[PDB]
Amino acid sequence: GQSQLFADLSREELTAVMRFLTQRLGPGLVDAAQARPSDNCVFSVELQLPPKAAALAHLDRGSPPPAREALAIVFFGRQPQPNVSELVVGPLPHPSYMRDVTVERHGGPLPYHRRPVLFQEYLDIDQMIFNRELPQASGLLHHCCFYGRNLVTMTTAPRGLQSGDRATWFGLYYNISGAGFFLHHVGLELLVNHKALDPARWTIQKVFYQGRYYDSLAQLEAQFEAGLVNVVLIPDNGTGGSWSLKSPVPPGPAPPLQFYPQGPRFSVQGSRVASSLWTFSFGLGAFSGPRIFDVRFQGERLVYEISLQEALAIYGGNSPAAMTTRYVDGGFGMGKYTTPLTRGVDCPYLATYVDWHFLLESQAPKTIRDAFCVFEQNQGLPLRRHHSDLYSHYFGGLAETVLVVRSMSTLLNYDYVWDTVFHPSGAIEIRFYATGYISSAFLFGATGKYGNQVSEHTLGTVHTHSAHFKVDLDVAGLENWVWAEDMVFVPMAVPWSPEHQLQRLQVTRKLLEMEEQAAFLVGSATPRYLYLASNHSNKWGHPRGYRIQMLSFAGEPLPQNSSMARGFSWERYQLAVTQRKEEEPSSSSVFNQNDPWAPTVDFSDFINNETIAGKDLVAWVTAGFLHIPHAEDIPNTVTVGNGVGFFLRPYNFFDEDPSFYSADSIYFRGDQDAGACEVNPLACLPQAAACAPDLPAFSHGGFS
Amino acid sequence: SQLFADLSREELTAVMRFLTQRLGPGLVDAAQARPSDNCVFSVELQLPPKAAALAHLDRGSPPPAREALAIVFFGRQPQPNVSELVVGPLPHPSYMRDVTVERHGGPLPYHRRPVLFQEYLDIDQMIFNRELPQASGLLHHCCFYKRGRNLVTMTTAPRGLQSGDRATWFGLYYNISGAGFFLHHVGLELLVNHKALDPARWTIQKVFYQGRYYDSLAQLEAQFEAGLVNVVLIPDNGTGGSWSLKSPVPPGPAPPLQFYPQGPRFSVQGSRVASSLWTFSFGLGAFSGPRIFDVRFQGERLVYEISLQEALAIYGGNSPAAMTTRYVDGGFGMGKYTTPLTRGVDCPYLATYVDWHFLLESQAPKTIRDAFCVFEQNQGLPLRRHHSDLYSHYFGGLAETVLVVRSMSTLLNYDYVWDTVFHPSGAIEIRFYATGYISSAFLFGATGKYGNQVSEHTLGTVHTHSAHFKVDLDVAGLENWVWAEDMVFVPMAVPWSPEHQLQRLQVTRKLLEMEEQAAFLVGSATPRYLYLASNHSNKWGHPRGYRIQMLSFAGEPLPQNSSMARGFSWERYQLAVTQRKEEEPSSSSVFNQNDPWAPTVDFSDFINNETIAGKDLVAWVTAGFLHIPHAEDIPNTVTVGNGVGFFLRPYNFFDEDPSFYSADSIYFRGDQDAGACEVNPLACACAPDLPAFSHGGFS
Numbered sequence A: 001g002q003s004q005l006f007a008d009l010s011r012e013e014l015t016a017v018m019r020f021l022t023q024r025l026g027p028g029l030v031d032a033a034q035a036r037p038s039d040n041c042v043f044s045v046e047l048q049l050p051p052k053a054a055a056l057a058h059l060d061r062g063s064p065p066p067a068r069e070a071l072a073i074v075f076f077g078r079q080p081q082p083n084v085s086e087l088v089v090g091p092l093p094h095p096s097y098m099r100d101v102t103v104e105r106h107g108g109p110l111p112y113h114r115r116p117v118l119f120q121e122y123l124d125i126d127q128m129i130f131n132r133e134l135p136q137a138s139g140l141l142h143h144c145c146f147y148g149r150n151l152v153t154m155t156t157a158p159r160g161l162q163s164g165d166r167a168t169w170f171g172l173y174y175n176i177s178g179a180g181f182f183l184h185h186v187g188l189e190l191l192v193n194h195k196a197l198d199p200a201r202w203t204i205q206k207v208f209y210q211g212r213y214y215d216s217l218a219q220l221e222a223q224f225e226a227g228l229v230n231v232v233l234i235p236d237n238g239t240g241g242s243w244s245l246k247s248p249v250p251p252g253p254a255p256p257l258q259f260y261p262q263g264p265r266f267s268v269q270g271s272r273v274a275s276s277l278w279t280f281s282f283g284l285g286a287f288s289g290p291r292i293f294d295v296r297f298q299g300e301r302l303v304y305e306i307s308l309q310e311a312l313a314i315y316g317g318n319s320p321a322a323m324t325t326r327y328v329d330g331g332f333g334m335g336k337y338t339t340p341l342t343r344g345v346d347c348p349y350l351a352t353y354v355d356w357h358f359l360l361e362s363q364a365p366k367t368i369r370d371a372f373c374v375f376e377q378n379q380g381l382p383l384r385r386h387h388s389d390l391y392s393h394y395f396g397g398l399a400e401t402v403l404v405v406r407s408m409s410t411l412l413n414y415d416y417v418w419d420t421v422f423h424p425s426g427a428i429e430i431r432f433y434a435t436g437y438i439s440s441a442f443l444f445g446a447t448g449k450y451g452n453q454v455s456e457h458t459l460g461t462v463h464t465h466s467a468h469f470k471v472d473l474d475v476a477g478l479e480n481w482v483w484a485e486d487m488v489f490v491p492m493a494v495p496w497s498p499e500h501q502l503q504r505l506q507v508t509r510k511l512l513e514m515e516e517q518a519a520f521l522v523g524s525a526t527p528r529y530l531y532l533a534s535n536h537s538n539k540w541g542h543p544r545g546y547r548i549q550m551l552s553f554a555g556e557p558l559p560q561n562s563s564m565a566r567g568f569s570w571e572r573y574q575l576a577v578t579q580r581k582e583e584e585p586s587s588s589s590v591f592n593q594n595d596p597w598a599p600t601v602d603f604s605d606f607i608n609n610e611t612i613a614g615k616d617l618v619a620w621v622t623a624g625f626l627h628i629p630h631a632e633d634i635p636n637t638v639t640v641g642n643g644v645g646f647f648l649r650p651y652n653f654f655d656e657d658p659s660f661y662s663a664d665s666i667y668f669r670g671d672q673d674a675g676a677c678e679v680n681p682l683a684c685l686p687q688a689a690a691c692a693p694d695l696p697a698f699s700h701g702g703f704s
Numbered sequence B: 001s002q003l004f005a006d007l008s009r010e011e012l013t014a015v016m017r018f019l020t021q022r023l024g025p026g027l028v029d030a031a032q033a034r035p036s037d038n039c040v041f042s043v044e045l046q047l048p049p050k051a052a053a054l055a056h057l058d059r060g061s062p063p064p065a066r067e068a069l070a071i072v073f074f075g076r077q078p079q080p081n082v083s084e085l086v087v088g089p090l091p092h093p094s095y096m097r098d099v100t101v102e103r104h105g106g107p108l109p110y111h112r113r114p115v116l117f118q119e120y121l122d123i124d125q126m127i128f129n130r131e132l133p134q135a136s137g138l139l140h141h142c143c144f145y146k147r148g149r150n151l152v153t154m155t156t157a158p159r160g161l162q163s164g165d166r167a168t169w170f171g172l173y174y175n176i177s178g179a180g181f182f183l184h185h186v187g188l189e190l191l192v193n194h195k196a197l198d199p200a201r202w203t204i205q206k207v208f209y210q211g212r213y214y215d216s217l218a219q220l221e222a223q224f225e226a227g228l229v230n231v232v233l234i235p236d237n238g239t240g241g242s243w244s245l246k247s248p249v250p251p252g253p254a255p256p257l258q259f260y261p262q263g264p265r266f267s268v269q270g271s272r273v274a275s276s277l278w279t280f281s282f283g284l285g286a287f288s289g290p291r292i293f294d295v296r297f298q299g300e301r302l303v304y305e306i307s308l309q310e311a312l313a314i315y316g317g318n319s320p321a322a323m324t325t326r327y328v329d330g331g332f333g334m335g336k337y338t339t340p341l342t343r344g345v346d347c348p349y350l351a352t353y354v355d356w357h358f359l360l361e362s363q364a365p366k367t368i369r370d371a372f373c374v375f376e377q378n379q380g381l382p383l384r385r386h387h388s389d390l391y392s393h394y395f396g397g398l399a400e401t402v403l404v405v406r407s408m409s410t411l412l413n414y415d416y417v418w419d420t421v422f423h424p425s426g427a428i429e430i431r432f433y434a435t436g437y438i439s440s441a442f443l444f445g446a447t448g449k450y451g452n453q454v455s456e457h458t459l460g461t462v463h464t465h466s467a468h469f470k471v472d473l474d475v476a477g478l479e480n481w482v483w484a485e486d487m488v489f490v491p492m493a494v495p496w497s498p499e500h501q502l503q504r505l506q507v508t509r510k511l512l513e514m515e516e517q518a519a520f521l522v523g524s525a526t527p528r529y530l531y532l533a534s535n536h537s538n539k540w541g542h543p544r545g546y547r548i549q550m551l552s553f554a555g556e557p558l559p560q561n562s563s564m565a566r567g568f569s570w571e572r573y574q575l576a577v578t579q580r581k582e583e584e585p586s587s588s589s590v591f592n593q594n595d596p597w598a599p600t601v602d603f604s605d606f607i608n609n610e611t612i613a614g615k616d617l618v619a620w621v622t623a624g625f626l627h628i629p630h631a632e633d634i635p636n637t638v639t640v641g642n643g644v645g646f647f648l649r650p651y652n653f654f655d656e657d658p659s660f661y662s663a664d665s666i667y668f669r670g671d672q673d674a675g676a677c678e679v680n681p682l683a684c685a686c687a688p689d690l691p692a693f694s695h696g697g698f699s
């Protein structure tokens, strides 16, 4: 079955679904890029992933491929009871039908306040701030901040305190040219209430300046002019790090460069990457972000899907913005906020780079150039090696080379790096880095219970990062069990001197039967060897397994006591294994960010006391850390040590190490000529086999 | 300025001629020595005292005498001792002092002494000439017996059960040609007693065949010939993996190759690496293994010393050899058992490669070619990046390049990989990988409580690996404190709507004042942020710090209840911080392997309830994992996912990211020509002309 079922929609296919929806949605249908709250609107159109039954029927058993469909989110603002609605639209490329799956999926209409804040909304909010509200305090603002074209606004987190609220705290910052404005908070923060569908009716519920609450910007300017406010002059320009990214040092000799001496050893065709060892499909959800499907090692499928589900950032702090802030980044979109990869910085210069197409908050499809990069990377390490000077004189090794796919999501200040790396041993590593700029507060007072001073007038606010992954392993077929292997010591008499005691080392295997048993809380310890496995077995008779191996420094999760916690229930777990249902496609939702108190998807609902003894299983992995900012996070947070993710590793899945059969392996005996070419491939790189290519002239995918 | 350089070949011959002429005649070469002889076991660099060394490197003083330390086996006397002697000054030695007593308070029992290469050879003459033909009937019928040329022997762990013992279990294995013999256990294990100083007197305390215990080989042969022993014939050759390393698949298009477009960006002179950012010295102890001294980031020193102290492997199993085995690898030697790096496999092809000289168990100095490699590696990752489509249109980042130093020690089956990697952010990563062959048993019976079947007739025995590192951080001078930062949530009324509650996130700092508070047991949780710091502060007024960040999947340590456990008490700790003394230079010792019950050094003695508030500190980091072998370990165990170690990371130590001032940084704005060469270095013969391949050879 040779189709590309998992490919993100092309631009024709988006135009096609747009044309279709235009014609059929009633007249009065506004473009989303200019829409007001009471308008109608196509928010999003993206690929609707196919149901698994049908997909595998095609891929494995040759049946016809399932209708390729799209899913549009529609803001219905023009009516007595405004709803959000999800509609499926197919088949592609010539759509002929549309049904409204909203009720059928979340049992009821979608409250209109759950909708993401549109780009027009943010723009209206700024008209309200800069034109109507902020000149009421123009005296204060001359005095402190060089006064509304030099200042600039930034959003927060959940918007309110209570299901249905839509009130956001907004920070104010100097509009720094050519570097991060995120460091130069001016101390002013405005709780805006924009729940109403008429922007004229929008209020400013509270105000916060340098330590103090006020009821309005008027009453702040009353108190300023009455001489009753100690105001702090915050510089406006400066130099190095806090103000720049451009290094003052001039370029020196060049760093090392990697090249393929005789052509590449893989190919990308559409959504499908293929190599001597690995074959897989890849994509970005608009909200979910990265994903790969149909991963096959030497022709056998290991995983149906691996895909980011959510990223979280829980903050604390002095100011109301920082202590309210819980970003659920799916609500903005890890795909929407993807950004071009800059060649030679984000991936190796000779990597192959791929575009990504999308239709969000517009009516034309746009394209993000160089959104993904795929490459083979020599790691420096040997994968494996042994040198025998003992009894027999030989050497046998293999340098590890690895296959890689990378996107980067720039969510305001943060640049998330998402890596999916494919080892020649049959292992799959998922990785998640955070760089970019820190979300900062204005430095004031009881600092230190809440973070570190990091520049003049700048607090680095404490926060946690957590991220969720879905790992739908299909280990040797759909029917899988989970096993927990570990270890134990048993006091025993030494057999041949019973007078003497010895501490006896033993393996421990428990087969986990129920969802509740394989759900592991953050804080609880957890089996050293945990793997999903098969009815089937390898040559020596052990169940065929793939083994999850985590890499987390997890923060304490937001306590359960909180009304908000439900919107990201998944943070509380390290790992959970679950019966994989069509009704349960995802862990979070775009709709949880703006109403986590009545969550649109609640992940703890999935762990519900069913068997996981021989069913189609799906593993859910949380990974993250705590981050007390510090001075070396200026200008940017750095990758080193901040890799988090997991390994999927073979455990009695094969009969031997597949890399035994590698084309790149190296062997020689003591009695051989190790530097003769017929014995050793490495002895010909010099003779002839050299010659770095001419390079492609540099290009860049641009900006908005 | 080369205080820390391992001894040259001249300097070894020099100490060896000096020791010859002054040790009494009757002084035998160690390679040939019998237990009752006298013997120079080792001569290696004696590291200088820290007061004096710093005096020299910082304050201009003259250098401390360059000295050597020789271990001498004094077997020819009424009470035989082992003795460590300092010998100086170099390169013209004129003195020699016996530090043994002054260091471990008394003589060194002769049984603590490492099993020499001649001892292993004598044990094999006993085994194959006197003992094994007593059972040539069984061995014809099970293992193709020829008079012992087809079989082969391998050591175990501590030797005996009790302080003073010297009785070693030995497994038998087919002598596979050109691939690891370690997978072909024949089922036979002999407890040999070799304590005596007269090899004629050596006994065979016990025997183990195929699940059952016998008192000698004669008795097993009685029981065999009586038809009373079910014998199975174990094949002798075979194909693929379990029997080979050579891939059957022909070489394909070549893998990616890294080269330096306009020459290297570092240099190696003797023991000293130098680069644009980093400057350090490097070496191997003979027993302790890798180490680096005088690490200087942009000229300021961060660490005095980082050094491997010990590697440990605890096993379990069906058979006596497996369940008795706890290898303390220092007792063999991580430096001795270092092996040449094979260019293009163990390190980048274009890396620079350095020799190592040693003098152990001989009288001439030998050399291990290509023992170290140093290289710059482009990682493919960015060190950092931001892309702004928001309010202002710009891009600013930096691909991470890294500097690396690597040695590999092959201890029998196991190939340990030791890495020291130097990030341009000011971080140092220490890494430890294990590859090579698994140590295997013969498959019989109750398997499964004890490991996995992994080939025909081969059990992969469960085991833990752990390793110990000494990290002598000198954060902004000698006086350091340690701090433990972490996090907490505090229920609080929302200020601006107090009828609602909010879970308020807060940092948590405690300054650890006592050694007991900064020693962290395996099992117990540990502060998310834990760093050594200074009196001094950065611009913003935070204490200047380096943070330790571990990477361990610890095995359960050997229980305390065990008589053996003191010989590696560092296994029970994740991390310990400690007043740094000259009487406490190391964590284990070469003498612990052969007598852990009366440990020659016991690490828990260092954690002794002193203050660590503003003292010269040292951190000790344990790292390791559990290994239940599995089919994908044949023919070798793979590196993937098996990296363990730690990061040493700036924490308010600088005023900003030093990489901000990087030469290889990249910046451009929306309104610029991103592909014009004057804006972007990335927008600009017959490249690598490669050295013809060579190899360091074998014994």
Ligand SMILES: *[C@@H]1O[C@H](CO)[C@@H](O[C@@H]2O[C@H](CO)[C@@H](O)[C@H](O)[C@H]2NC(C)=O)[C@H](O)[C@H]1NC(C)=O
Binding pocket: A025, A076, A079, A083, A084, A085, A100, A103, A108, A109
């Ligand atoms: C959500 O909104 C849409 C319209 O704004 C509702 O769908 C319409 O329903 C009426 C009568 O029920 C039909 O005659 C229209 O033609 C429908 N339009 C479409 C395209 O679906 C919808 O029922 C509302 N859903 C809920 C449950 O609130």
Ligand SMILES: *[C@@H]1O[C@H](CO)[C@@H](O[C@@H]2O[C@H](CO)[C@@H](O)[C@H](O)[C@H]2NC(C)=O)[C@H](O)[C@H]1NC(C)=O
Binding pocket: B023, B074, B077, B081, B082, B083, B098, B100, B101, B106, B107
């Ligand atoms: C270990 O043995 C050595 C020699 O077998 C001892 O060293 C000698 O000590 C005698 C006096 O007891 C001196 O006269 C010799 O000149 C010494 N030789 C050297 C090179 O030291 C040593 O005393 C023994 N160590 C202990 C602690 O017993």
Ligand SMILES: *[C@@H]1O[C@H](CO)[C@@H](O)[C@H](O)[C@H]1NC(C)=O
Binding pocket: A148, A149, A150, A151, A152, A175, A176, A177, A178, B391, B392, B393
């Ligand atoms: C912010 O700064 C940039 C200059 O790079 C400018 O183009 C933009 O118009 C400024 N003003 C605001 C309020 O966004």
Ligand SMILES: *[C@@H]1O[C@H](CO)[C@@H](O)[C@H](O)[C@H]1NC(C)=O
Binding pocket: A391, A392, B148, B149, B150, B151, B152, B175, B176, B177, B178
């Ligand atoms: C073992 O086999 C090797 C080569 O395969 C041989 O050279 C050696 O001498 C043999 N005998 C022993 C016991 O070492």
Ligand SMILES: [Ca+2]
Binding pocket: A515, A578, A579, A605, A606, A607, A608, A609, A610
């Ligand atoms: Ca369920």
Ligand SMILES: [Ca+2]
Binding pocket: A472, A473, A474, A475, A478, A480, A580, A616, A617, A618
């Ligand atoms: Ca599955």
Ligand SMILES: [Ca+2]
Binding pocket: B515, B578, B579, B605, B606, B607, B608, B610
């Ligand atoms: Ca102490």
Ligand SMILES: [Ca+2]
Binding pocket: B304, B472, B473, B474, B475, B478, B480, B580, B616, B617, B618
């Ligand atoms: Ca120190």
Ligand SMILES: [Cu+2]
Binding pocket: A434, A463, A465, A627, A637
């Ligand atoms: Cu962060």
Ligand SMILES: [Cu+2]
Binding pocket: B434, B463, B465, B627, B637
């Ligand atoms: Cu192991």
